[PDB]
Design a protein around this ligand. Structure first.
Ligand SMILES: [Mn+2]
Ligand SMILES: [Mn+2]
Ligand SMILES: [Mn+2]
Ligand SMILES: [Mn+2]
Ligand SMILES: [Mn+2]
Ligand SMILES: [Mn+2]
Ligand SMILES: [Mn+2]
Ligand SMILES: [Mn+2]
Lengths: 194, 194, 194, 193, 202, 196, 193, 196
């Protein structure tokens, strides 16, 4: 039951291969949405049956898979082809300004992110979040969401499956190349909010 | 469309320990709210998930988690309780647990002080649980409606949220704890223990 | 030692918004207990310091923090409140503050809907505060008796623990939040804003 | 925490302890241990709030010190009683004296032992007779250090110079000889059981 | 000389085919494992300075790089000896008669153990390891997250690396295909030896 | 070993008045200080004849007495040199310009140093001393307990006795007043001579 | 006051400890202690009558360090005996070897630990088997420092480099191995009681 | 090759005769200093695993070992470069004109300094080092116990090792003889460089 990417599978080349995008979407993400759907269906049954032992395990399944589904979804909306105007950081004036108030420059921040991204041990994500008025950079393990009271602005997937087929162990290269497909329109929309 | 199951006894069945007014509110308002909100979130998810509506999905995962937790805790709680006259209020109904307890904390009475101390020391809203962790037993408390940690199995629980007692004991927590012992369903605790 | 401050009004001054019975229990029992348990925690922390009961000293540091915080919170709270008849109930008593509220939210009514959405979204026990953070205003929530974080000056708070309202409103915290605006002391709020 | 009243008037322990010593000892030495204990605890919760880990360590020290000072002087005042009270008669502590004569030879041999212990404290200190579960021991503590854990204090004797200097100058021995006259053996007996 | 180094493998990079491809083995060994060693040395270098220069800030930073790459190096070094060519006698459980008998006693049978292990392998969220450990007299299946090494007091018998880089090129997201095929290249002779010797013996 | 012949004070008992009373100066020297001297002497004599025999049990017992009383005598000896009448030249700090210079750089002001040491002095628990010591070219303020001497590597410049017999007869429990007034009779001449 | 002669010829302890080392350690190293103690006691009265405070600080140091040096080596030579003596046999210390095995599991396990702590010393010091109230303990001391009050020496081993260097050079290890042959277990047993 | 290693001497083991024998130089360099380097290298390795295994009790003991062996390593590394054959011009204080000027400015003479250093060297109880250091723009003589490095803020100019393994095979217990003779092989060119 899974919505199509806002773009083609090769729309993010050469930063991210058509191969990686299809596998990430039709296999990794799909799996989370499927097992989420499954867990959600059984749960309606376990309620009526008054199966409390089941409801506990299904609470685990729903939390875990719902997190994976949301992470990749936030992710696909964080990306656009490199040519698109949504790639140019002027699309996020108010945010970038707060970036430079906090880290000084755009680049002093891309650097700060890169460092945190490549410092993740295992699987996880890197997030630019909003906390109150200021910004932190945070990382999350596995499919954990950001701690409460932070608002995702944009995320970078640092699971190996997100780059391995193209960059092998070269995660530093992967990180240098994603900046070219980041969607600053979206980061702006989420920096302001509702 | 799940329907909140009725209690296994009358609202007045646990007096004098727990007033009928409390049973009625606790079940018909407080627990019913967990079910109704659970119900709405589950019926809404297919809509949000189809619209690729990420902010509603975050919100709905939260409502599923908090409200399902809520419903789990009170279902286990009602089953933990029986009228103080019923033989299931007699700790003789639980030979193996009452031994395993007596092995861990010296006697039954020493364990009741132990739990009572843990219950009374809860800061804000939460539950006290006697749990089965691995081989032996353990007293844990949980925050708000949080489940016990994975690997632990509930034997019995006590709601320490203020609505569980305020209408009848006001700020007199220790009295509430002292009187809840008479309506603990030891039959249920033995089943859960084996 | 610390002492229970008196109230700047009679136990029945906040009717009909908050009943005299809540006000008498909230003040002479709940807040009282925080004072008493802070004073006793201090005394008993010294004696545990004489011996080398480090677990005790660790646990008594927790108790000193918690009761002191509960002490500050309730002491601040009773001053955010005045009888509804009073001109301090009138936002006109807070000219600078309501102005800055208006340029932060939309209007005072948008601010009230926002703070009420915060207040009702607290899971378990907690407080909702309007604070100063540098030059602007923010709504924050805290769990249990936690104080507002550093750098934030509290303008006014609302207790969302069930003992704040339950005897009069039961689980109807919506009606409690709607009514407490009739007794918010905008003169205290305005004096704290500066 | 507060300043306990003495069981007697400031001049009730004469001629062993001058009323000047007793008045200063209780009204200003002990007082200051009390006050300083209050304030340190008051400020301690603020330091906890602030997560001001420096000030928590400073105050933890000031709390232990004034804390112990307040304990020691409070037991002290109740070890003492006017030399003419029947509480000053060793005969008013039968079980203790029995065991005391068991452990050392005489009640006099314990007095010379305990006095040897008091006169060899270096700097400021206390001497105590204590119950070590089954048996009695003479121990000494430096400054305001209270008796080690497990040891129940039966009676103590202050050897800070402020306890005797105005009346005995540097003659520590004259101070110890004379203080025996005002040991409250009824207290020492209650605390034994 | 105060630096660890990359152990040469006990076989060529293709010896474990078709179970694990010669590409994975070469990237896993000379790139992933190599980088754990290299960083471990780069951090041990400066730790001595910043310890005597009482630079407690970077004392802490370096301790972390050393915990991490130190554990990366241990775990992969144990792993390369757990494996052997599928055609070797060392890959036959009968190479570990004491250990396999203890396994059968502990679980139901050898196959009931494989079932439980693979269930633990697949249930890891993100990166991590599954191990057969001996804990006192008994055996256990445990998992560790990321590069965490087998906890003190336990002795590792064999581990299987579930980090994606260990299988992704050949198996993609197919974690269960990976696990089913690594049974064919478990070195049970290495397993027996560890079961029979001390912790320090490995 | 011979006989201890405790030198006299380099001024008369009433010299340091009105700061330190004549009653204290007399008893501090002839009773507290002399008691260290005589006790050290008798311990050294006994130590002699515990070496003459191989009485190693009491060689060990007498070391502590040799250390405590030797220390109490040195400390008080030094103490008398740090002192000189309020009216003297050497009570003025300019008698020690190489020192009063180093003190300013370190705390800011000769008065900001009186406070730092007033604070250290009044904060000693029980019996002890306060010293302005020399860590090569740096000046620390340290406290020692009982008759302990300063740590290896520290070199004394001037000490102030905070034992109660140093003030009690005159100042009772008024530690602060004793300290405030004891600045007036510090021998800054002695201060610098040890500095250099 | 003289250097007391050794309980044995300078070559009695060979081949564990050379006659060379024994003579140097006793006739020069230990002699220096005695000569410094003789000089300091003899020349204290002069320095004190002159108010030579710097010199009195030195004589306190000289009496301290040399006094400790003299006590330590005095106890050292008594802990030793020829490898051929019945006293070099732990069986001469049955009570102590009982208490050693009860605390380390074996003689070889205590030797293992004793030598670990000796070879562990940084710079100059001593290793001791002491008697800590009821039980047994390996401690080390720095330079000539005595063991802490309340500990009772049983046997010591000198770990200063002068104790072994002419024979063993940097071979810290070899010294400890071979010194086990010349421990006076007879002396060790008598100090254990 | 690894992380730390024994450095080669800048001269032959017998170069410092007659004041330090070739047997001492070889032992001191290839056994004593070597042991510092190796124990430090193996200490870093046992530390690396012991944090992985979360063995906190051995973490802190190996932090100790690392600090101790690191300090022994630096100390002897500085030592070897303080020395040179007595026939070299480098052994002539005229090699250190800026330092010798500041030397006399402080102590009076080169000789008056050598007696101060000598009395500090001989006054060490047990094992340790004596250094000329640069603290600020001034110099002073400090001693350290065992392998302690000089206090930060101090800059070593030269050090003289007073561990018995540095002199005993040649001078036995005659430290004074060893101190007098080591002045002939002090490398004052190194001293001058370190001072600038
Ligand atoms: Mn992904
Ligand atoms: Mn409830
Ligand atoms: Mn409240
Ligand atoms: Mn007192
Ligand atoms: Mn791997
Ligand atoms: Mn004095
Ligand atoms: Mn020796
Ligand atoms: Mn050396």
């Amino acid at each position: 039951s899974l919505p199509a990417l806002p773009y083609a599978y090769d729309a993010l080349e050469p930063s991210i291969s058509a191969q990686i995008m299809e596998l990430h979407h039709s296999k990794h993400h799909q799996t989370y949405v499927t097992n989420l759907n499954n867990a959600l269906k059984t749960y309606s049954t376990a309620l009526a049956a008054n199966d409390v032992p089941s409801q506990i395990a299904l609470q685990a399944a729903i939390k875990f898979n719902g997190a994976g589904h949301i992470n990749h979804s936030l992710f696909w909306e964080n990306l656009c082809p490199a040519s698109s105007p949504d790639a140019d950081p002027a699309s996020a004036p108010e945010l970038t300004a707060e970036i430079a108030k906090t880290w000084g420059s755009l680049d002093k921040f891309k650097e700060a992110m890169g460092k945190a991204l490549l410092g993740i041990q295992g699987s996880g994500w890197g997030w630019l979040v909003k906390e109150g008025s200021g910004l932190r950079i945070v990382t999350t393990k596995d499919q954990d969401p950001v701690v409460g009271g932070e608002v995702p602005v944009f995320g970078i997937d640092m699971w190996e499956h997100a780059y391995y087929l193209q960059y092998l162990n070269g995660k530093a290269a992967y990180v240098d190349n994603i900046w070219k497909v980041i969607n600053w329109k979206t980061a702006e929309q989420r920096f302001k909010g509702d």
